[PDB]
Amino acid sequence: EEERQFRKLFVQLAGDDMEVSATELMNILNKVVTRHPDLKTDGFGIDTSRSMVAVMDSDTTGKLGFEEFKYLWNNIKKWQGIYKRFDTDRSGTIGSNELPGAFEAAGFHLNQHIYSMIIRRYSDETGNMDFDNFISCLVRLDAMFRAFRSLDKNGTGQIQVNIQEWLQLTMYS
Amino acid sequence: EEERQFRKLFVQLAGDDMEVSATELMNILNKVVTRHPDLKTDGFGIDTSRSMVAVMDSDTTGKLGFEEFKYLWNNIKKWQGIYKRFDTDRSGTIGSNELPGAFEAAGFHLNQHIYSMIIRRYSDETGNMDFDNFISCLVRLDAMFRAFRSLDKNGTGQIQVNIQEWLQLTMYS
Ligand SMILES: [Ca+2]
Numbered sequence A, B: 001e002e003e004r005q006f007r008k009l010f011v012q013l014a015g016d017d018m019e020v021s022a023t024e025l026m027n028i029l030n031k032v033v034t035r036h037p038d039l040k041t042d043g044f045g046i047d048t049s050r051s052m053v054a055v056m057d058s059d060t061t062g063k064l065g066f067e068e069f070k071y072l073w074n075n076i077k078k079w080q081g082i083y084k085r086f087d088t089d090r091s092g093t094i095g096s097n098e099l100p101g102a103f104e105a106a107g108f109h110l111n112q113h114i115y116s117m118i119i120r121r122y123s124d125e126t127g128n129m130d131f132d133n134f135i136s137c138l139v140r141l142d143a144m145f146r147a148f149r150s151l152d153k154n155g156t157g158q159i160q161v162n163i164q165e166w167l168q169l170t171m172y173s
C-alpha cells in the first residue's frame, strides 16, 4: 500500500507533464515544513529547488521522472528523521556538535576539514544549519559521492575529467 | 576619485570584521537591482549569496576580503553591462538567442551542449534568465574554469582528483 500511496502522491505532484519540476518540488517541500513546525527553516526557495532537481536529473530532461523523484523523496524522508533525532537540544536546527552524528547516521564518514568546510558553507554564525540547508547539503553530498564513484571506474581513488565533463558536473548542479 | 570611492564602499560594506559576509553581499546586490529596475529579477536571496561567497572565498575565511570582493565586484560590474547591451529585445532578461553573445562578450567560448545545460539549469520555461541567475551563473562559470586550469598542472586537458579534493571543489561552492 506504500508503493500505491506514493504513486498517487507522484501522479498528483507531477501533473500533466508526468514530471516534477523545480517549482512543484519547492511547493511540496514547503508543505512538509509547514506540517512540521519543529523544523526551523526560512523555507526552500526556487534556487535551492532548481539545484536539487539538477543534481537529481540523471536523464537531463530538466525535471524529475518517477524514479528520480522516488530516490530523492525517500532520501529526504530518511534525512528528515535523522535531523529530528540528532537535534538533541531541540533547537530545530543542526549545530556543529550535532552534525557529525547526523551525517554518520546518513551514511557519510567525513573528516574534520570537510566538516569545517560544510559548516562554513551551510551553517550560520553560530555554526547552526536549518532544515532546507541540511537537506540541500545532503542531497548534494550524496550526488557528489555517487558521481565520483561513477567516474572512478578502476577503483584507484582518483577520477580524471576533461573540461566538458568538469563543466557538466559542476554547472548542472 | 573612484578608487577612493571603492575602498570607501568596501569599508562601509565590510564593517567591523573587515570582511564581506554572504548577508552583506546580499544587501548590496539587492540595492543594485533596486536602483536598476530595467534588470528583471526576483532578487538575490541568501542561498545564491552564500554560494557566490563560497566560490569566491579563496582563503576559506568564510567571507570576502578586500581583494576577493574587489575581483567579484568588478566582474559583476562588467557582466551587468553585458546583460544590458546583449538584451537586444529589451525584455530585461537574457533569452536563449541572446545568451551565446553575452557569454562570448564575457570571455566564454562554450559549445551547444554546455549552452543547453546552462539554459536548462538557469533559464525559465521560455528559455529566459533573469539578472541574479545570469550573475550567479557567470560567477560560478568563471570559478570553475579557473579551478580547472589550476588543477590541470601539466596542461593535458585532464585533471585528476581524489575524493577529498572533489568534495572541497563541489561542496564548497
Ligand atoms: Ca509537472
Ligand SMILES: [Ca+2]
Binding pocket: A056, A057, A058, A059, A060, A061, A062, A063, A064, A065, A068
Ligand atoms: Ca529527468
Ligand SMILES: [Ca+2]
Binding pocket: A086, A087, A088, A089, A090, A091, A092, A093, A094, A095, A098
Ligand atoms: Ca540542535
Ligand SMILES: [Ca+2]
Binding pocket: A041, A042, A043, A130, A131, A132, A133
Ligand atoms: Ca535555509
Ligand SMILES: [Ca+2]
Binding pocket: B013, B014, B015, B016, B017, B018, B019, B020, B021, B024
Ligand atoms: Ca562584515
Ligand SMILES: [Ca+2]
Binding pocket: B056, B057, B058, B059, B060, B061, B062, B063, B064, B065, B068
Ligand atoms: Ca576570504
Ligand SMILES: [Ca+2]
Binding pocket: B086, B087, B088, B089, B090, B091, B092, B093, B094, B095, B098
Ligand atoms: Ca532579452
Ligand SMILES: [Ca+2]
Binding pocket: B041, B042, B043, B130, B131, B132, B133
Ligand atoms: Ca532569479
